[PDB]
Amino acid sequence: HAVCVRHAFKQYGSKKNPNHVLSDLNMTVAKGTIYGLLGASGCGKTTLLSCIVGRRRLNTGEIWVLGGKPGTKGSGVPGKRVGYMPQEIALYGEFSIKETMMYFGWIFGMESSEINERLQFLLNFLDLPSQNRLVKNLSGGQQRRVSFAVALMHDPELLILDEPTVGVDPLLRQSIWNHLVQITKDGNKTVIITTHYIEEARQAHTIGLMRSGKLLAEESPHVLLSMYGCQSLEEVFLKLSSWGKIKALLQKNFLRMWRNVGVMLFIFALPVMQVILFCLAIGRDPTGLKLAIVNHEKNYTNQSYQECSFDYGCKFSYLSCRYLNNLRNSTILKEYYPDPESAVDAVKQGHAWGALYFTENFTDALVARMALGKDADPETLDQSEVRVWLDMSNQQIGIILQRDLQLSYQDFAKDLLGACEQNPDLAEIPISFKEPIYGSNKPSFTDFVAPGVILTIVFFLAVALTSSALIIERMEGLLDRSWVAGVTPGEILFSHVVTQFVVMCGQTALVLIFMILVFGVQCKGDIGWVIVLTILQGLCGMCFGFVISAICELERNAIQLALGSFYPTLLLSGVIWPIEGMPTVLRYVSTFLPLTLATTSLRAMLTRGWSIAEPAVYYGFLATIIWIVAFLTISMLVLRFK
Amino acid sequence: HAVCVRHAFKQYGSKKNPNHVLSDLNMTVAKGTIYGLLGASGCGKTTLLSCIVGRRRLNTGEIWVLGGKPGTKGSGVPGKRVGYMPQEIALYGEFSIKETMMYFGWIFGMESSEINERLQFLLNFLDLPSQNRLVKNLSGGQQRRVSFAVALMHDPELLILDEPTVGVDPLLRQSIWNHLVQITKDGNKTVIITTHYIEEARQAHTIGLMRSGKLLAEESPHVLLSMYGCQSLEEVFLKLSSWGKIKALLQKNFLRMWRNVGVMLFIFALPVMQVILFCLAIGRDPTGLKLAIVNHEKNYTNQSYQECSFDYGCKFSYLSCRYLNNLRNSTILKEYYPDPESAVDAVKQGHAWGALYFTENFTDALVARMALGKDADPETLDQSEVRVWLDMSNQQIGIILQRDLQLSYQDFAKDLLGACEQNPDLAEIPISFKEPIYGSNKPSFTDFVAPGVILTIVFFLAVALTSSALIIERMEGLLDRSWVAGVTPGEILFSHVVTQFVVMCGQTALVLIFMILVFGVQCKGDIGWVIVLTILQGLCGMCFGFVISAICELERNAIQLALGSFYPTLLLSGVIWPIEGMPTVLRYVSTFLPLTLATTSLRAMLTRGWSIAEPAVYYGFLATIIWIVAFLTISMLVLRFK
Ligand SMILES: CCCCCCCCCCC(CCCCCCCCCC)(CO[C@@H]1O[C@H](CO)[C@@H](O[C@H]2O[C@H](CO)[C@@H](O)[C@H](O)[C@H]2O)[C@H](O)[C@H]1O)CO[C@@H]1O[C@H](CO)[C@@H](O[C@H]2O[C@H](CO)[C@@H](O)[C@H](O)[C@H]2O)[C@H](O)[C@H]1O
Ligand SMILES: CCCCCCCCCCC(CCCCCCCCCC)(CO[C@@H]1O[C@H](CO)[C@@H](O[C@H]2O[C@H](CO)[C@@H](O)[C@H](O)[C@H]2O)[C@H](O)[C@H]1O)CO[C@@H]1O[C@H](CO)[C@@H](O[C@H]2O[C@H](CO)[C@@H](O)[C@H](O)[C@H]2O)[C@H](O)[C@H]1O
Ligand SMILES: CC/C=C\C/C=C/C/C=C\C/C=C/C/C=C/CCCCOC[C@H](COP(=O)(O)OCCN)OC(=O)CCCCCCCCCCCCCCCCC
Ligand SMILES: CC/C=C\C/C=C\C/C=C/C/C=C/C/C=C\CCCCOC[C@H](COP(=O)(O)OCCN)OC(=O)CCCCCCCCCCCCCCCCC
Ligand SMILES: CCCCCCCC/C=C\CCCCCCCC(=O)N[C@@H](CO)[C@H](O)CCCCCCCCCCCCCCC
């Protein structure tokens, strides 16, 4: 009437050593009775119950329950017509008892006014603590009783229970059995219960004894004892032979993140700290650089004083303190030494980045050098020069020092003339740099790396959240419990995409506000298309999190896969160094990576202000869309023939 | 009397809603009998057994087992005089049955010859599969049977068993109970067993009924039954009121890593390919940049051909193809456009990086400009210049393009002299750079980031490996099982340090071999001192993983703690950018970070060849040692009061 199983096979393990849990099996459960399923091992009964509710799909079998096959649109197994208690405690923490009751009632479509009566009745009957207590703050027995109350709340016509009374007090166990007997009799309710107390299953109506994947007997307990003349059942076994369902899922997802402070800090406060620290340390020009100066045109007094005095008008008095007046104060500090040997010794230590030497004949030789032109003898060309020894072990510092020293002389050369009706253009190399077409004369390395930092934060934090949430929830039977309740797989997936979309929108707003408004990173292009590209890259990472969760079953295995691809793609996507420095063969391969073309597209919009119509901009838009499709296809193809 | 317990109080919960697991409880176990604990809930029995074996301590009470308090002298609890079967399966996977028995027998000091006989007897007795099957490849019942065999193998005088028979067939249950009765037959053996099947405890000599954290009664089963004529125990419970243990651990640790392929890929193959990709993509100079050339001194033919021809001796034929002959071909690609306006349009698209635009009067004006000197009119000063419009949105590209355009003119100017029998020194700016004190004239950025990629890989690979290994083993109960076998915490920590030290030595060798011997990263200092500092940073990360494992209890919490400190310290340790770019306040704070002074010390040795005697070199050695002491102090304090 209620359940009928015929020829049900199932096995686990490899082909060489298979663990046969189920073999040729026959079961018939009458409507309106308590059945009772006793077996030597707890795995076969669990597999049978999971196949009955329709969540395991055993091979080469036949299950008929409440109209037809589970989940076939001819029966009512997935929905409010059955009440399922799993073997594990498939309950959400950080939720009170009343909140759990309300959530599961909203899933089953009960009115909020008729849920309170059931909640109070179950609280009184099952000896439970206050309804405001969090589930994670309860003990194992209390949590199991709360799960039982959840299974009993909606009054189903079929109850499938997996060890409801395992560590319950004998008085409470007796009361529970009396309640089950009462609701079963004089009604249309059927109970299928598996227990370890064989004697306790004496009020049951049709005991089915399970052994070696088959049923040794299935018949009334009293009559079974009558046939063999036994006073206990123990020695008989000794045989030597749908929108409202989306609000509930959406509300639950937002409350789980809000009540986890550590989760809120990792996905919202961690990105802000990286942006703040990156904009304060990476890309700025060094400023604290010390140079050793040996000016032999002036008396030496101290390592911090030189008395650099000269007449600013004309007559070219010193021309060596005049040159040092044009040195940029922001990046270079000046220290003074008495000998070139002692100044060089400072550079050989960590006391200076370079040494400058002026001979006592510098002024006269320099004045004569410009007055002779191409007729200057080698003597005046020797004494009219500044000897510079530099520490070039640091690439960025050496570039700054050389550029500042050279640009300081250009200002010095253009300052000597100009008041004498001489155009400063006489002191220019024929190679003349006009106004830059893009950018300025002082480009910043922070502006080059900033586009890649934004995309990597949004992409890789969507992989971690999606992979962990789906793996954890699937591994403790939380998805399976909701599927039996009548929640379709398309509704669960829809609610996950919406929740992740809102999360990544908050991250995008926070990252862009600090980078642009606070730290002054330039954005020459349209900010509308900058947001769209950032959101699309976040959705690309979410689809990659579907792939990881579809192939991994432990959380420790998922993080290794994520970190195993987070490192190689960072070094090949041109985030910290220009892509033009790579070898040609490696450069071509890198263009097919998920983030390479999008980082280039974002950089052009921020640094050059290019529009969406430029090929270099929309090429990164299309590469993100293709990777989204590829990631979704890979995740589906895992289950296509499996 | 084997066990005596008096007034043992224990609870598990918060002060607001305490969960009193134990209350005033008295328990007495006699020598040579079977004692059965038959509590209603498994929390009290498990806690009592754990307190008896010493792995847990209760708030107030007294425990006396086999001579005294467990864990101290006199008592023989943590040793081979007891046999413990924990509630959960505490066996190592990836190990065969035989290897498990040999490992545990080696722990107990038994000879390899007597372990074989016990293994054969237990395999025959417990109906276990072949001895060569891996533990991870068995079902949930065979694993429990192997755990029971491990408990029984070394023949102890006191057996503490936590549900030895739960899913066992009754046919095997009868044999197991018969074996227990036969071994406990007028001897020194004592068995304490908790079972769900109350009637199976009829063969036990004493029965202890547990309820509400105490014992309702403690008497023989037959005396208890003959109190009012009861014929079963169901109604009775219805009441309303050191050289050889380190070697074994060392061999086990290396075998677990070798038999986990995914573990060796993450810690040995990932760092090698991370170094390879860094040395191929990061730090190199762009070498494919395109420039649009407008040369009106010659006819226009194509975008790839120009017919640049000139004489080499004298007479200054064209001087525009002579300058373009001095351009570096390794980094600049020349494209030709017919008009200056069309060449700028190429730069406004992604087709070029700059424009040159030689004027049709360049040759005549350049020779007149260099033959007049200070008497050059503005007309020849305008026609003799090269007008460069550059794309300056990229900082590193703009440095290369400007540097190469100006150095190619220096060779061009030096070539014009000498061919005219003139001094080449006449084309020198009075700022003359001598031979560098450190480094060369062409510094590399990949030589700046290499000292700091080595340290980052070694440091953070020890945090992840140490934290995961210690957290997983404590949760699964393997650590507690080995403590009751007589393995002190000193040898567990000693064997873990040696295993991590060998792993970090292999990582160091692989990183330095590929970075220096294969990719040619310079090492001007002592290689031996470079090795010492790298290993020192590895041990520093190991001690940081000790703190994380002592604080966290789940692997997902430890990963977020490690990643939450990996991101900030990397951006503040001067790895990818010089430390001189950040503000002074931020630079002061960053010097106290674990990896900041060590990165500076390693860079000095590799790039300058400095010795250990230099203050900039041995500050990184002292900063690393101090952080090791601080990390070992924090972890010890955490375990002291938590
Ligand atoms: C777009 C997708 C929408 C989905 C939105 C929903 C997502 C929420 C997922 C929640 C989640 C995933 C975290 C994912 C990490 C993300 C980064 C990835 C990792 C980086 C690569 C957070 O996980 C929780 O994080 C907490 C952080 O606060 C942590 O708390 C710790 O640190 C705190 C801080 O210091 C500190 O104060 C606190 O003391 C610490 O305990 C919890 O221990 C930890 O479990 C896991 O949920 C957890 O599941 C647990 C049982 O599995 C569940 O345990 C309860 O339930 C059972 C009986 O009912 C039973 O098991 C337990 O007896 C019971 O307790 C927890 O209740 C639940 O929370
Ligand atoms: C300093 C020296 C320390 C000691 C040596 C260190 C290693 C010791 C711990 C080893 C360890 C932690 C590794 C984490 C370290 C790195 C994390 C860093 C994180 C970075 C952020 C690796 O864990 C292994 O990782 C495997 C990866 O290969 C993975 O296998 C997966 O991918 C494979 C690939 O194809 C694929 O074939 C395979 O099918 C996949 O499953 C499994 O999870 C596991 O085998 C955990 O050990 C595991 O413990 C498991 C019980 O929990 C134990 O479970 C087994 O047995 C149980 C019977 O009690 C039974 O109940 C379980 O059902 C059964 O499964 C595993 O057997 C054992 O191995
Ligand atoms: C950023 C995006 C970049 C690229 C995107 C994509 C490319 C392709 C798109 C999809 C294809 C693949 C994704 C990855 C999959 C691949 C499939 C198969 C894995 C299935 O994984 C099963 C279990 C987990 O299985 P389990 O948990 O036990 O569940 C039971 C199921 N059997 O993995 C584990 O343990 C492994 C744990 C980490 C293993 C390595 C970590 C780091 C790698 C470093 C090594 C690199 C060097 C290369 C080695 C060669 C040199 C000798
Ligand atoms: C290279 C780096 C080296 C050194 C760095 C520097 C200094 C080192 C001094 C180190 C000492 C300690 C650090 C540990 C501190 C303290 C304990 C806490 C957790 C103890 O733990 C509890 C459970 C785990 O507890 P549980 O697993 O449940 O076990 C039960 C035990 N109650 O953690 C969790 O959930 C946390 C999961 C991730 C939380 C955040 C992740 C990323 C942080 C980003 C936020 C940054 C911005 C700050 C926010 C302020 C502005 C609003
Ligand atoms: C997807 C998995 C990650 C989950 C969480 C992702 C959330 C956001 C990610 C980064 C936030 C953006 C903040 C910096 C990320 C991108 C921006 C940047 O500036 N990146 C550079 C510096 O961070 C770049 O990474 C430099 C690498 C050179 C050194 C390489 C050594 C690598 C060690 C390998 C072994 C250590 C293992 C430790 C634990 C094993």
Side-chain angles (χ1 to χ4, degrees):
Chain A
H1 295 288
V3 196
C4 280
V5 185
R6 303 286 186 251
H7 307 67
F9 292 90
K10 171 135 217 74
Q11 93 213 27
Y12 292 118
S14 78
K15 293 178 179 179
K16 295 180 178 181
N17 290 325
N19 171 38
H20 292 293
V21 278
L22 291 181
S23 71
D24 201 354
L25 177 63
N26 282 47
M27 158 135 48
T28 291
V29 181
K31 169 193 316 293
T33 52
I34 310 179
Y35 184 75
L37 189 63
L38 323 158
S41 150
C43 182
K45 334 200 261 186
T46 290
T47 306
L48 195 43
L49 293 197
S50 287
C51 295
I52 282 179
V53 291
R55 62 180 271 205
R56 268 212 151 150
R57 267 190 177 174
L58 87 177
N59 38 53
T60 73
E62 214 35 72
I63 297 171
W64 186 97
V65 175
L66 284 197
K69 195 173 287 95
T72 205
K73 214 176 180 179
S75 57
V77 180
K80 54 205 261 305
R81 284 228 274 154
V82 83
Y84 179 55
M85 196 206 191
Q87 201 183 270
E88 76 266 325
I89 310 157
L91 288 179
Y92 293 111
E94 73 256 78
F95 270 67
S96 75
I97 307 171
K98 181 179 179 178
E99 292 187 348
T100 299
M101 282 333 163
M102 287 294 169
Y103 171 79
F104 272 109
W106 296 337
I107 290 315
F108 290 124
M110 329 179 34
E111 232 74 68
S112 193
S113 66
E114 56 145 321
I115 297 183
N116 278 337
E117 281 68 0
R118 287 304 278 169
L119 166 67
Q120 314 293 2
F121 171 81
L122 296 165
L123 281 177
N124 190 14
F125 158 65
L126 279 167
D127 159 13
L128 288 168
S130 195
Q131 75 203 41
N132 294 308
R133 304 258 325 251
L134 254 49
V135 156
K136 51 158 205 185
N137 285 343
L138 308 170
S139 62
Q142 301 173 297
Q143 280 173 15
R144 260 212 107 73
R145 258 132 67 214
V146 168
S147 169
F148 193 30
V150 159
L152 275 166
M153 169 202 31
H154 58 299
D155 284 328
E157 65 152 312
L158 183 57
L159 283 144
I160 291 136
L161 321 159
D162 223 317
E163 284 269 40
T165 55
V166 56
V168 188
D169 200 79
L171 294 188
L172 195 52
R173 158 144 37 84
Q174 195 210 333
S175 87
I176 282 179
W177 263 97
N178 277 269
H179 173 78
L180 287 182
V181 169
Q182 186 305 347
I183 85 188
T184 294
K185 290 181 176 180
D186 220 349
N188 305 343
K189 310 233 166 322
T190 295
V191 186
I192 304 180
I193 171 150
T194 67
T195 199
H196 262 156
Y197 307 103
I198 314 198
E199 297 309 311
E200 198 97 39
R202 195 94 55 114
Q203 275 161 303
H205 303 182
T206 301
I207 291 264
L209 303 166
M210 172 146 255
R211 211 220 192 233
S212 270
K214 281 183 47 44
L215 251 56
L216 310 183
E218 173 188 53
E219 204 205 332
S220 189
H222 334 292
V223 157
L224 223 61
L225 288 169
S226 321
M227 317 183 15
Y228 299 118
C230 312
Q231 36 82 31
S232 95
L233 274 166
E234 188 58 89
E235 28 170 44
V236 191
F237 216 133
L238 266 206
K239 285 172 206 267
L240 293 101
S241 191
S242 164
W243 173 240
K245 201 140 69 204
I246 280 160
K247 319 200 237 257
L249 291 153
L250 274 175
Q251 176 172 162
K252 173 208 44 155
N253 276 342
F254 287 128
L255 273 194
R256 288 191 84 208
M257 307 183 324
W258 184 240
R259 284 164 189 206
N260 287 306
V261 155
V263 168
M264 275 279 157
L265 282 181
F266 189 75
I267 63 147
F268 279 124
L270 185 99
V272 173
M273 203 225 303
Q274 307 177 227
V275 164
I276 290 186
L277 289 184
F278 162 78
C279 284
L280 273 179
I282 314 292
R284 283 154 104 112
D285 274 356
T287 59
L289 318 175
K290 273 183 271 151
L291 248 56
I293 289 137
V294 183
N295 195 350
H296 269 185
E297 303 212 283
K298 299 230 143 216
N299 287 343
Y300 174 76
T301 59
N302 197 358
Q303 205 192 109
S304 67
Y305 188 68
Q306 184 74 262
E307 201 285 356
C308 296
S309 292
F310 73 110
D311 56 335
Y312 296 73
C314 204
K315 306 175 223 153
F316 302 145
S317 210
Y318 286 101
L319 286 195
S320 77
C321 320
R322 182 168 200 148
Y323 166 77
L324 296 158
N325 204 50
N326 292 273
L327 259 173
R328 282 88 159 99
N329 286 113
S330 48
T331 47
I332 287 148
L333 304 166
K334 293 199 256 292
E335 326 267 335
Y336 308 97
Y337 285 81
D339 274 306
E341 291 86 28
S342 63
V344 167
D345 278 6
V347 194
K348 290 218 237 269
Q349 286 135 37
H351 299 166
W353 282 103
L356 263 61
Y357 179 43
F358 294 87
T359 315
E360 79 257 23
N361 296 305
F362 176 79
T363 305
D364 281 310
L366 184 75
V367 167
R369 154 182 208 138
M370 337 187 264
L372 251 51
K374 30 176 195 308
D375 310 87
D377 42 299
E379 159 84 2
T380 83
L381 291 176
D382 169 5
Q383 299 278 294
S384 63
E385 73 168 28
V386 198
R387 299 119 178 118
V388 186
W389 297 275
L390 282 189
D391 192 339
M392 320 279 327
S393 59
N394 211 308
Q395 205 233 25
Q396 292 309 311
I397 286 166
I399 288 172
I400 294 169
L401 285 178
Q402 288 192 306
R403 166 205 86 200
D404 271 20
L405 280 167
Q406 257 143 32
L407 296 200
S408 314
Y409 188 80
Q410 263 279 312
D411 314 344
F412 169 72
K414 285 198 296 236
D415 164 60
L416 287 190
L417 62 80
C420 295
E421 310 295 327
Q422 325 214 321
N423 39 321
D425 303 355
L426 287 160
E428 322 260 335
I429 285 327
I431 306 290
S432 70
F433 291 102
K434 297 302 166 231
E435 165 100 16
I437 290 166
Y438 293 126
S440 63
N441 281 321
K442 201 85 81 183
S444 201
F445 198 61
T446 317
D447 287 26
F448 171 81
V449 185
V453 169
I454 299 159
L455 288 194
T456 43
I457 283 169
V458 181
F459 181 95
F460 285 109
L461 268 174
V463 186
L465 191 52
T466 301
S467 196
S468 313
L470 285 181
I471 280 179
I472 294 163
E473 178 122 14
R474 186 236 288 122
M475 100 190 165
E476 34 209 50
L478 283 166
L479 298 191
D480 303 68
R481 180 157 210 165
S482 75
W483 188 88
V484 188
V487 179
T488 44
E491 279 165 21
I492 290 155
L493 194 84
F494 179 81
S495 288
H496 185 98
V497 177
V498 168
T499 306
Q500 177 94 77
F501 178 74
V502 176
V503 161
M504 77 183 38
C505 277
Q507 291 175 324
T508 296
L510 274 174
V511 165
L512 286 188
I513 277 175
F514 277 94
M515 278 225 183
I516 293 178
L517 276 159
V518 175
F519 290 114
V521 169
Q522 274 316 300
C523 174
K524 311 244 181 327
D526 192 6
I527 201 63
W529 293 106
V530 167
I531 294 167
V532 170
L533 190 49
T534 314
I535 285 170
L536 284 190
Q537 269 290 305
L539 291 161
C540 198
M542 178 190 84
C543 294
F544 187 43
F546 288 151
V547 187
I548 297 180
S549 81
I551 81 194
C552 269
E553 295 167 356
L554 276 155
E555 229 197 317
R556 61 155 154 275
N557 296 149
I559 191 68
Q560 288 175 50
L561 272 183
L563 293 175
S565 309
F566 161 69
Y567 297 147
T569 57
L570 245 192
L571 305 159
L572 292 191
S573 79
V575 159
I576 43 160
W577 196 247
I579 204 92
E580 284 83 23
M582 281 154 90
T584 316
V585 197
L586 192 66
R587 183 174 340 180
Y588 287 5
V589 154
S590 89
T591 44
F592 296 93
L593 295 194
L595 290 95
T596 304
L597 278 176
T599 315
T600 312
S601 160
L602 194 71
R603 205 172 271 124
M605 303 199 266
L606 300 168
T607 59
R608 314 197 219 215
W610 277 351
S611 51
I612 194 59
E614 315 265 345
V617 164
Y618 65 69
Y619 275 166
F621 270 85
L622 301 156
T624 311
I625 293 155
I626 296 178
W627 268 111
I628 283 161
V629 169
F631 278 145
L632 281 176
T633 309
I634 291 164
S635 91
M636 287 334 158
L637 217 33
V638 166
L639 330 174
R640 160 64 69 238
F641 57 89
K642 198 200 288 246
Chain B
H1 289 223
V3 174
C4 292
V5 183
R6 298 296 186 257
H7 313 70
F9 282 92
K10 178 76 175 108
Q11 92 197 335
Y12 262 136
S14 63
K15 195 173 183 177
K16 293 178 180 178
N17 284 319
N19 172 4
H20 298 156
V21 175
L22 287 192
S23 290
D24 193 0
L25 164 140
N26 297 39
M27 170 168 165
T28 285
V29 185
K31 183 156 308 194
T33 80
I34 310 190
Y35 192 94
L37 203 56
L38 301 178
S41 99
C43 208
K45 322 201 258 175
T46 285
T47 314
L48 192 45
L49 291 198
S50 299
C51 293
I52 283 175
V53 296
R55 70 196 282 223
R56 311 220 105 80
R57 190 41 209 198
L58 64 94
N59 308 341
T60 312
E62 286 169 344
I63 303 192
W64 189 97
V65 185
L66 281 197
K69 180 163 146 45
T72 89
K73 294 319 150 232
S75 45
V77 175
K80 85 196 175 170
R81 278 226 273 161
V82 83
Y84 182 51
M85 176 170 183
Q87 165 93 297
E88 79 262 72
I89 294 144
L91 301 164
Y92 286 114
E94 82 261 68
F95 264 100
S96 67
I97 302 172
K98 186 215 173 90
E99 296 181 348
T100 290
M101 317 273 300
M102 305 288 246
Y103 165 80
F104 266 108
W106 288 332
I107 286 296
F108 288 123
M110 330 174 36
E111 317 275 74
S112 269
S113 82
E114 59 200 68
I115 302 167
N116 269 49
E117 313 299 276
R118 291 296 274 156
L119 166 72
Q120 294 301 129
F121 169 79
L122 292 162
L123 282 191
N124 192 336
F125 167 60
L126 280 155
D127 209 312
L128 284 167
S130 66
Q131 46 167 49
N132 292 308
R133 306 257 332 252
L134 266 58
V135 165
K136 55 165 208 201
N137 285 339
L138 319 161
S139 62
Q142 322 195 273
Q143 284 171 3
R144 275 200 87 77
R145 300 217 287 286
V146 170
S147 175
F148 192 31
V150 153
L152 280 176
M153 51 153 315
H154 61 292
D155 223 325
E157 78 183 32
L158 165 70
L159 291 158
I160 318 276
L161 310 164
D162 223 318
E163 323 266 352
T165 64
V166 48
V168 188
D169 289 345
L171 290 194
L172 197 57
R173 255 141 60 190
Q174 253 205 350
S175 70
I176 284 176
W177 266 94
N178 270 350
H179 171 82
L180 282 178
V181 172
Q182 150 246 303
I183 70 172
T184 308
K185 179 86 64 45
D186 282 344
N188 203 9
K189 300 245 176 326
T190 316
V191 189
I192 296 171
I193 171 181
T194 88
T195 173
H196 278 142
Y197 322 108
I198 311 194
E199 287 305 317
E200 256 179 20
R202 283 286 273 273
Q203 261 161 301
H205 298 199
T206 320
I207 288 297
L209 304 175
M210 223 182 168
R211 191 177 181 279
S212 278
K214 61 166 56 58
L215 253 62
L216 310 161
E218 174 184 69
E219 266 273 354
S220 64
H222 86 110
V223 158
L224 265 194
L225 274 182
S226 296
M227 104 195 288
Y228 271 139
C230 308
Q231 70 279 334
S232 90
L233 278 152
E234 274 90 11
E235 34 208 43
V236 191
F237 197 30
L238 268 181
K239 294 199 189 85
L240 294 97
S241 69
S242 198
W243 178 242
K245 290 204 266 228
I246 288 167
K247 266 166 39 206
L249 290 167
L250 268 176
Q251 153 161 2
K252 175 208 89 219
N253 271 344
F254 286 129
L255 230 42
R256 291 190 63 203
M257 265 180 330
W258 168 254
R259 280 173 196 202
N260 289 302
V261 169
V263 159
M264 299 247 279
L265 284 187
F266 197 69
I267 69 157
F268 280 127
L270 183 91
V272 157
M273 89 147 167
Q274 252 215 286
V275 164
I276 290 179
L277 293 182
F278 166 81
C279 277
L280 279 170
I282 316 292
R284 290 137 101 81
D285 273 6
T287 36
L289 318 176
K290 264 182 252 163
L291 275 90
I293 323 283
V294 189
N295 204 345
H296 276 193
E297 301 209 285
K298 300 244 146 218
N299 272 336
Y300 177 77
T301 310
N302 230 340
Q303 207 188 298
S304 64
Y305 187 71
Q306 178 62 88
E307 146 64 26
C308 292
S309 184
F310 64 99
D311 56 7
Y312 282 85
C314 274
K315 292 179 179 179
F316 315 133
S317 63
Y318 285 103
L319 284 196
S320 38
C321 328
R322 198 173 186 156
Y323 168 74
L324 293 170
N325 204 60
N326 283 284
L327 265 170
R328 283 82 175 99
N329 319 46
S330 53
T331 180
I332 281 166
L333 298 163
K334 299 202 266 292
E335 314 259 322
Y336 305 100
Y337 289 76
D339 227 17
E341 302 87 16
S342 66
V344 182
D345 295 5
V347 193
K348 263 161 197 141
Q349 300 143 15
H351 298 144
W353 285 104
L356 250 52
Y357 183 38
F358 295 92
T359 307
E360 80 218 323
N361 285 315
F362 178 80
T363 309
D364 314 285
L366 184 68
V367 304
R369 153 178 203 161
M370 73 185 30
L372 283 161
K374 316 118 73 173
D375 289 345
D377 46 280
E379 182 79 11
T380 79
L381 280 185
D382 197 57
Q383 239 67 231
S384 46
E385 69 176 37
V386 196
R387 311 103 192 269
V388 188
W389 303 269
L390 281 191
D391 192 341
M392 297 304 281
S393 35
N394 213 299
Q395 198 234 11
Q396 299 294 144
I397 304 264
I399 289 176
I400 297 266
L401 286 179
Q402 285 196 144
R403 190 210 46 196
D404 279 336
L405 274 155
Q406 296 184 273
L407 297 166
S408 320
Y409 180 79
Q410 279 290 128
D411 322 311
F412 169 66
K414 287 190 199 313
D415 181 30
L416 291 194
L417 315 162
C420 282
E421 307 95 75
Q422 312 226 48
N423 194 23
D425 273 26
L426 284 150
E428 307 277 2
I429 285 97
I431 305 285
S432 58
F433 291 97
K434 300 306 187 227
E435 214 257 317
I437 291 172
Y438 288 121
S440 58
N441 323 81
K442 190 92 146 280
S444 207
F445 193 66
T446 185
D447 282 0
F448 172 84
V449 201
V453 156
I454 300 158
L455 290 190
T456 290
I457 287 174
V458 173
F459 185 95
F460 288 108
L461 263 205
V463 177
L465 183 58
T466 285
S467 286
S468 309
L470 286 176
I471 284 173
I472 288 163
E473 215 213 4
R474 169 173 84 239
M475 296 180 336
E476 301 209 44
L478 300 141
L479 198 62
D480 255 319
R481 172 162 224 173
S482 72
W483 186 90
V484 197
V487 182
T488 58
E491 330 171 330
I492 283 168
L493 199 82
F494 176 80
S495 99
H496 173 93
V497 169
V498 180
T499 309
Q500 178 91 74
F501 175 77
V502 167
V503 161
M504 102 176 46
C505 275
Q507 276 161 19
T508 298
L510 280 167
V511 160
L512 291 183
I513 277 173
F514 272 95
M515 203 141 210
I516 303 181
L517 249 57
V518 180
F519 283 108
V521 159
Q522 274 313 307
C523 179
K524 324 221 180 175
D526 196 356
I527 182 82
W529 283 113
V530 166
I531 292 165
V532 177
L533 186 59
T534 314
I535 275 159
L536 269 186
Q537 279 276 294
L539 297 166
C540 198
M542 194 198 44
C543 299
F544 183 43
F546 284 160
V547 181
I548 284 173
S549 80
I551 285 184
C552 290
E553 274 188 359
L554 280 139
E555 308 139 60
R556 67 160 156 275
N557 289 334
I559 276 146
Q560 298 174 56
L561 251 195
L563 286 180
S565 64
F566 157 76
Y567 295 139
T569 63
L570 194 126
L571 299 166
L572 254 47
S573 72
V575 164
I576 55 181
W577 197 246
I579 216 74
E580 288 87 15
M582 29 186 105
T584 85
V585 198
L586 198 60
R587 192 176 333 171
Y588 289 10
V589 155
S590 99
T591 51
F592 300 103
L593 291 187
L595 291 101
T596 305
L597 282 188
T599 296
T600 295
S601 180
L602 183 67
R603 195 175 283 122
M605 290 186 273
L606 284 170
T607 53
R608 308 205 222 211
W610 276 354
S611 59
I612 192 68
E614 310 271 339
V617 167
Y618 68 67
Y619 283 156
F621 281 81
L622 295 171
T624 306
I625 278 145
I626 293 186
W627 269 108
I628 281 166
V629 174
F631 277 144
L632 287 182
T633 302
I634 291 162
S635 81
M636 219 51 242
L637 285 181
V638 153
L639 308 159
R640 199 201 59 160
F641 48 81
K642 254 206 178 50

